[PDB]
Design a protein around this nucleic acid. Structure first.
Ligand code: CA
Ligand code: MG
Ligand code: MG
Length: 430
DNA sequence: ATTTTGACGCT
DNA sequence: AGCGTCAAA
């Protein structure tokens, strides 16, 4: 009771751009705005693979990973924007640069952890304390929270979505204890005010809309974010966790969407996150290991301590290309030419990175896949990255992989290569 | 024949 | 160091 830590010590937000690559293309081409549209890579095979989908097109059932020919079967008027191709491969530069726009805006408000090209965690604890001091116990107006949902509300004794949103927000604000600067619910509420301001700044200065979750840790913030998409933000309080988790499939919590979450379900014979509360910490550790067991015991109670790491820039810079089916590289000069294309894109991005961010990569990671291999990577080998030189980098990658060739033949390559991947890693300040 | 990414844990 | 997991668009 009095010594039971409740995981209410921080205010953490997760901001995620809505249908991000689509929004980048729609900002560039106004003909695509407010339309069912998608972003596609390549075009020859089945119209290209869809990698992002507007909410208008999602209403027709269009999804990511769909071939555009099939998506057009669901959505005959679907508009498409193609990823740029350079040196024979898809090139994501436009989206990386849009991401920088958004991340630099967010960093004005607080320390951020770049979580992916279009999402960042925000540690708002300090900013919240300062805003609380400036407000002088003044109550928080619903007008400061015009796109915020309070998960779990309204409850107790309208048929429209905005009307529900407002009633729950009213109930929340009417219950708030604003005279206590230490109340975690008030801190989350002020966090939500700041996130409204952050999201307005992002939209004003880029045109991009986003959603956000606000809660006491990264996992709950990430979950909250997805509850009301697009263009809305959701506050998940500590008190909301029991009800929220009671029907929440385990696979919806970050890191449990894969094999571990499957084993939790299988071994324990449960379906929802809240059912985890009925096991002791030692039981969970026995099944899933010391670290996972401790994490699960705390997480099913809404508690998690993983910090928002101060890192706005990616730690690796990589280029990769698949060679599916019959395109798999079967000659030496094929392998070498594609290694060079990858190395040239890598050198461009690396030189830009060094100029912008005062750092130099020191290691080159070469990874390949062989035809008929189960895994995504069949082999991974490192070498020194000493010069931002695409010919040297491609030569060194070839040197470290040349020995994979089972061909007794000079020119030929066997087994054929279905994937090449060059990654620059191990950055040092420059 | 989703493809092209990025972070982190285990041994 | 190399492999595997989990996740983004
Ligand atoms: Ca997104
Ligand atoms: Mg995202
Ligand atoms: Mg997504």
């Amino acid at each position: 009771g009095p010594h039971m830590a409740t995981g209410q010590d921080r205010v953490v937000a997760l901001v995620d751009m809505d249908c991000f690559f689509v929004q980048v293309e729609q900002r560039q081409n106004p003909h695509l705005r407010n339309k069912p549209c998608a972003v596609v890579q390549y075009k020859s095979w089945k119209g290209g693979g869809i990698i992002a989908v507007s909410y208008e097109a999602r209403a027709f059932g269009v999804t990511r990973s769909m071939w555009a020919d099939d998506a057009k079967k669901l959505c005959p008027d679907l508009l498409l924007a193609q990823v740029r191709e350079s040196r024979g491969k898809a090139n994501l530069t436009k989206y990386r640069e849009a991401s920088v726009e958004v991340m630099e805006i967010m960093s004005r408000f607080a320390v951020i952890e770049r979580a992916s090209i279009d999402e960042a965690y925000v540690d708002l604890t300090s900013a919240v304390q300062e805003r609380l001091q400036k407000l002088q116990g003044q109550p928080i107006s619903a007008d400061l929270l015009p796109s915020t949902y309070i998960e779990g509300l309204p409850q107790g004794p309208t048929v429209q979505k905005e009307g529900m949103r407002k009633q729950g927000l009213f109930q929340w604000l009417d219950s708030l204890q604003i005279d206590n600067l230490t109340s975690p619910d008030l801190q989350l509420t002020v966090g939500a005010v700041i996130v409204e301001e952050m999201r307005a700044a992002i939209e004003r200065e880029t045109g991009f809309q986003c959603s956000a979750g606000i809660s006491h840790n990264k996992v709950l913030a990430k979950l909250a974010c997805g509850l009301n998409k697009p263009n809305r933000q959701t506050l998940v309080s500590h008190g909301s966790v029991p009800q929220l988790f009671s029907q929440m499939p385990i696979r919806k919590i970050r890191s449990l969407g894969g094999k571990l979450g499957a084993s939790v379900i299988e071994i324990l014979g449960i379906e929802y996150m809240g059912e985890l509360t009925q096991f002791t910490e030692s039981q969970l550790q026995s099944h899933f290991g010391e670290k996972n067991g401790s994490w699960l015991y705390a997480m099913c109670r809404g508690i998690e301590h993983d910090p928002v790491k101060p890192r706005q820039l990616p730690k690796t810079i990589g280029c990769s290309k698949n060679f599916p089916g019959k395109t798999a590289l079967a000659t030496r000069e094929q392998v070498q030419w594609w290694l060079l294309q990858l190395a040239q894109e890598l050198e461009e991005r690396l030189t830009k990175d060094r100029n912008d961010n005062d750092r130099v990569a020191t290691q080159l990671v070469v990874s390949i896949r062989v035809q008929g291999d189960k895994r995504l990577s069949s082999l991974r080998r490192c070498c020194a990255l000493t010069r931002y030189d695409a010919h040297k980098m491609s030569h060194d990658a070839f040197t470290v992989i040349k020995n994979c060739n089972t061909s007794g033949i000079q020119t030929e390559w066997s087994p054929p290569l279905t994937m090449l991947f060059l990654c620059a890693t191990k950055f040092s300040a420059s």
